[PDB]
Amino acid sequence: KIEEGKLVIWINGDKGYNGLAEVGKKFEKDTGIKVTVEHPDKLEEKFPQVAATGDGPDIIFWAHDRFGGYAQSGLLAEITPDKAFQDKLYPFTWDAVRYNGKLIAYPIAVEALSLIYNKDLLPNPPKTWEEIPALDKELKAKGKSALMFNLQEPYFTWPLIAADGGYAFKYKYDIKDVGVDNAGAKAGLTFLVDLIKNKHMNADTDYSIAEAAFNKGETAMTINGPWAWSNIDTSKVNYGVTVLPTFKGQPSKPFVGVLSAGINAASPNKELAKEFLENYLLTDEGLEAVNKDKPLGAVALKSYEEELAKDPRIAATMENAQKGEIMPNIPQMSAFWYAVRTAVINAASGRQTVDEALKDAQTGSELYRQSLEIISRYLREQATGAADTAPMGASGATSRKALETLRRVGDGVQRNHETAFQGMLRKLDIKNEDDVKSLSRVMIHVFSDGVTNWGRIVTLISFGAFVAKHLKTINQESCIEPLAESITDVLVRTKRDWLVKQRGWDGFVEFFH
Numbered sequence: 073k074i075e076e077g078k079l080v081i082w083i084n085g086d087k088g089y090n091g092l093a094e095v096g097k098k099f100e101k102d103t104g105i106k107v108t109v110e111h112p113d114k115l116e117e118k119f120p121q122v123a124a125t126g127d128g129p130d131i132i133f134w135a136h137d138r139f140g141g142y143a144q145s146g147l148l149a150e151i152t153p154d155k156a157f158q159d160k161l162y163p164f165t166w167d168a169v170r171y172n173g174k175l176i177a178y179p180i181a182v183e184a185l186s187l188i189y190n191k192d193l194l195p196n197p198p199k200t201w202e203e204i205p206a207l208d209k210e211l212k213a214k215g216k217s218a219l220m221f222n223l224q225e226p227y228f229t230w231p232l233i234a235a236d237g238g239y240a241f242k243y244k245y246d247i248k249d250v251g252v253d254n255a256g257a258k259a260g261l262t263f264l265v266d267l268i269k270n271k272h273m274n275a276d277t278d279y280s281i282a283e284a285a286f287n288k289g290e291t292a293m294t295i296n297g298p299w300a301w302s303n304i305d306t307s308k309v310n311y312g313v314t315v316l317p318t319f320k321g322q323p324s325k326p327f328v329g330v331l332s333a334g335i336n337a338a339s340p341n342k343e344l345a346k347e348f349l350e351n352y353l354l355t356d357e358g359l360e361a362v363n364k365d366k367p368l369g370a371v372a373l374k375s376y377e378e379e380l381a382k383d384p385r386i387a388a389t390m391e392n393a394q395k396g397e398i399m400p401n402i403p404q405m406s407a408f409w410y411a412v413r414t415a416v417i418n419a420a421s422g423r424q425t426v427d428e429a430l431k432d433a434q435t436g437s438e439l440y441r442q443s444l445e446i447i448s449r450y451l452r453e454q455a456t457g458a459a460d461t462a463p464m465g466a467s468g469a470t471s472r473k474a475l476e477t478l479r480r481v482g483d484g485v486q487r488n489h490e491t492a493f494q495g496m497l498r499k500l501d502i503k504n505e506d507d508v509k510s511l512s513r514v515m516i517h518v519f520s521d522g523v524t525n526w527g528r529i530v531t532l533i534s535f536g537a538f539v540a541k542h543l544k545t546i547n548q549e550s551c552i553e554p555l556a557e558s559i560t561d562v563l564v565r566t567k568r569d570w571l572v573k574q575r576g577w578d579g580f581v582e583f584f585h
């Protein structure tokens with residue numbers, strides 16, 4: 073599928089892709105290999121679907137948070153730089169691109185949101201979020217506004233949400249512990265909704281609108297990353313970059329991202345990509361080429377970062393980064409981001425209340441792990457005859473009651489559909505972990521076809537248990553957990569919006585009560 077003898081690269085439209093293409097030209101001048109740089113819309117969504125079919129770019133650029141999902145899906149090639157190259161980058165940047173013990177990408181730069189303010193409108197930036205309403209009122213009398221930033225991406229709103237105690241996954245990570253719906257998160261989002269209620273912000277303000285307003289000098293402040301600095305320079309706005317405002321006396325905690333370059337598992341040009349990334353991009357001159365297009369932030373390369381660190385704007389970036397947290401790269405990050413995105417937009421527009429919106433975001437973020445906990449335990453206890461003695465953990469009553477519901481209803485299905493299941497089992501012929509990996513396509517084909525209800529979900533899991541008993545019987549018990557993860561993946565991927573609308577596994581319990 074992917075063409076040999078050339079390099080195709082994907083990077084976001086807000087990054088210095090003209091600078092990157094110029095690095096690609098130097099690579100072409102040396103090697104005779106053409107390098108095509110593209111910046112397609114929603115590439116972070118497009119990549120996992122096209123790469124799965126063996127297609128897509130040789131190299132994909134994104135923040136490290138999305139890269140665990142890719143690797144888990146077998147979409148990323150394991151990268152193996154020698155010691156000499158590894159020592160040229162900061163170790164913690166390597167940490168951000170490590171997944172299950174393996175390095176799955178090259179770290180490029182460290183990104184953190186900062187407060188960007190117009191020094192001509194606002195000689196001193198506000199230290200607190202609380203004082204911004206009164207500041208806006210003051211600025212409105214001059215035909216200006218205080219603050220405008222992207223409200224369509226939760227990335228920009230998260231620092232405020234996390235300030236008073238809101239969090240994604242509790243940190244060792246406890247993935248079952250999601251704090252998107254606690255008091256702190258409610259406090260942060262409410263303050264944002266109130267800003268909109270009191271005409272201090274507009275719910276439909278996106279990236280382009282916020283950037284245009286600041287760079288034209290219509291609003292005193294914005295919230296953005298280093299990549300935005302270029303266009304602000306062009307606009308000749310007397311701007312400064314500083315620490316984010318505190319909320320309730322506590323610092324804003326932005327999720328910190330490490331711009332990373334991954335190599336497609338289906339790429340026939342893995343050696344070319346490695347050569348490009350190591351010996352052309354991750355150099356003083358290579359990063360400078362991109363940085364001069366759009367600023368990268370604090371780059372992973374020590375030799376170049378030592379120079380950039382002298383920039384007050386970089387100092388402000390790293391200060392904000394220190395008060396924030398490095399994003400997790402667990403596969404669930406995509407689901408978390410989608411849930412929180414919807415929650416922020418819905419609360420901002422009044423479609424839901426803060427309590428309602430964050431409630432759904434909680435259910436959406438927990439959905440995979442909670443589903444896995446239930447499906448894994450059912451499959452394993454059915455196969456072995458004995459239950460799991462371990463505590464259910466967070467949201468334990470839900471998991472426990474769902475499992476008990478599943479036991480009652482699942483056993484009925486397996487009983488009544490026994491002959492049908494045995495016929496299906498024989499046709500699939502499942503005898504090792506290799507065969508279990510093949511099931512994903514067949515499973516998705518049958519399940520996603522037709523209507524949606526709890527009954528089909530029970531059938532899905534019950535046949536999974538039926539297969540699990542077969543796997544155990546033929547001494548393939550090690551294949552049960554991969555099967556459980558596979559089924560769980562299919563379920564939450566295909567019925568994500570439906571499950572959330574049913575209030576998750578609580579809905580399942582109530583439905584069969």
Ligand SMILES: Cc1ccnc(-n2ccnc2)c1-c1cccc2c(CCCOc3cccc4ccccc34)c(C(=O)O)n(CC(=O)N3CCNCC3)c12
Pocket residue numbers: 489492493496500511514515516518519528531532533535536537539559
């Ligand atoms: C129970 C039944 C009766 C008649 N035809 C059937 N069957 C259908 C296709 N293959 C077998 C089935 C049937 C057999 C096995 C599973 C299902 C499912 C769940 C969706 C896919 O489940 C899996 C497929 C392949 C491997 C799997 C490994 C582990 C766990 C699940 C696996 C359904 C369903 O989605 O409702 N059905 C019923 C079904 O799809 N029908 C087709 C339309 N008319 C009613 C029956 C399962």
Ligand SMILES: OC[C@H]1O[C@H](O[C@H]2[C@H](O)[C@@H](O)[C@@H](O)O[C@@H]2CO)[C@H](O)[C@@H](O)[C@@H]1O
Pocket residue numbers: 084086116135136137138183225226227228297329409
């Ligand atoms: O808004 C959710 C989004 O946040 C992050 O995306 C950032 C990205 O890290 C930055 O480099 C820049 O492009 O802004 C983006 C926000 O629009 C996460 O990396 C991403 O996974 C997540 O969906």
